[PDB]
Each structure stands twice: as C-alpha cells, then as structure tokens.
Design a protein around this ligand. Structure first.
Ligand SMILES: NC(=O)c1ccc[n+]([C@@H]2O[C@H](COP(=O)([O-])OP(=O)(O)OC[C@H]3O[C@@H](n4cnc5c(N)ncnc54)[C@H](O)[C@@H]3O)[C@@H](O)[C@H]2O)c1
Length: 167
C-alpha cells in the first residue's frame, strides 16, 4: 500500500516543451479545494500551485479520449475541424507530490480523488520519463499513437509523499 512511484498527466503541450522544461504550476494559490474543483486551474483563475496527476493511467486516457471526442463533436456541429493531438506523460512521483484525497480530507476537516496526486509548484523535467502522443485525423477519422522517451529523465528511488499537503 505504498504511495505510487509512477503517476500520469494528460496535457495538450508537446515533449519539445515538457521534456526539457518540465511542468510549472499556474501560480501560487495552494488552496486544495479550489484546485480539486478546478476553480484555480485553466478554466478558472489560472493560478493553482499544483500540477495535476493521477496514479491511474486509465484516468488520463479517459480525459484524453473525452477531449478527442469533443473535437469530433465540434466537427459534426461545424464548429471545428476534428483534428486533435493529446499527450499522456508518465512521471516519477516524489515527496513534492501529495495525495488529493488525503489533502482534501485534511483541508475540509480543518477549514470546512483517490488516485489523484497534486504536484506542488513544479514537475521537473528529470521526473518526466516518457510520453504517449495520440493524433486523431479529423478528415479521415484515423487515430495514431506514438511513444517517446525523455533523455533527461533521471531514474531514482522516489515515491509520492505519504502525508496530506499542508500550507
Ligand atoms: N491533467 C491530468 O491528467 C489530471 C490528473 C488528475 C486530476 N486532474 C484533475 O483535473 C482538473 C485539472 O485538470 P488539468 O490538469 O487538465 O488542469 P490544468 O489547468 O493544469 O491544465 C489544463 C491545460 O492548461 C494548459 N496549461 C496548464 N498549465 C499551464 C501553464 N503553467 N502554462 C501554460 N499553460 C498551461 C495546458 O493546455 C493544459 O492541458 C483538476 O480538478 C484535477 O484534480 C487532472
């Protein structure tokens, strides 16, 4: 029952960025509830201090597939071309990654998800092992999946933090 050593992240940005630069959080807002509900992420205030990840690869695949299907529906409605490129990054978790569920309960119990892990501030490029790229051709309907390894990845023994996030 150890914390996961491996987590996954769906993102629109490509490895030429992520493999060299890692992921950087939107900002300095470390309110766990605002992050988990998305209020501080891109669709909200775009200032969350956490980069979202999941220990469940399937979770990130469902997310990617949903964004792809939304591109398909936009084409069927004439408000899009149907083209879609998404990425799933495979990431080594360390002590800056905090379990969402435990962090949520710590927050609500004090001031008031099971597979989600909040990476505080950054996921350095050395933590990012590989990426799966999924390309959906909106014109022909064909989907193609490719994989790439990060030469900058550092293999070391780390796992997610066992404790909830606290500010
Ligand atoms: N992304 C995942 O795989 C993942 C994993 C677990 C949980 N979640 C949950 O989903 C919600 C967050 O979804 P999310 O991670 O897609 O939100 P997010 O705001 O971090 O990212 C959404 C999109 O914003 C862009 N982006 C993100 N950070 C950026 C930055 N610093 N600079 C420039 N562009 C940036 C990218 O296009 C990205 O795909 C949360 O409620 C979270 O709990 C997501």
């Amino acid at each position: 029952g150890d914390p996961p050593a491996t987590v996954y992240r769906y993102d629109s940005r490509p490895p030429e960025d992520v493999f060299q630069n890692g992921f950087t959080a939107w900002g300095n807002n470390d309110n766990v509830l605002e992050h988990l509900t998305g209020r501080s992420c891109q669709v909200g205030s775009s200032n969350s201090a956490f980069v979202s990840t999941s220990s469940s690869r399937r979770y990130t695949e469902v997310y990617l597939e949903h964004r792809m299907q939304e591109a398909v529906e936009a084409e069927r409605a004439g408000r899009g071309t149907g083209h879609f490129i998404g990425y799933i990054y495979e990431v080594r978790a360390d002590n800056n990654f905090y379990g969402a569920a435990s962090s949520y309960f710590e927050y609500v119990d004090t001031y008031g998800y099971q597979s989600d892990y909040l990476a505080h501030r950054r996921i350095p490029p050395e933590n990012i092992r590989r990426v799966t790229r999924v390309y959906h051709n909106g014109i022909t309907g064909e989907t193609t999946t490719t994989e790439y390894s990060n030469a900058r990845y550092v293999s070391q023994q780390t796992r997610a933090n066992p404790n909830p996030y606290t500010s």
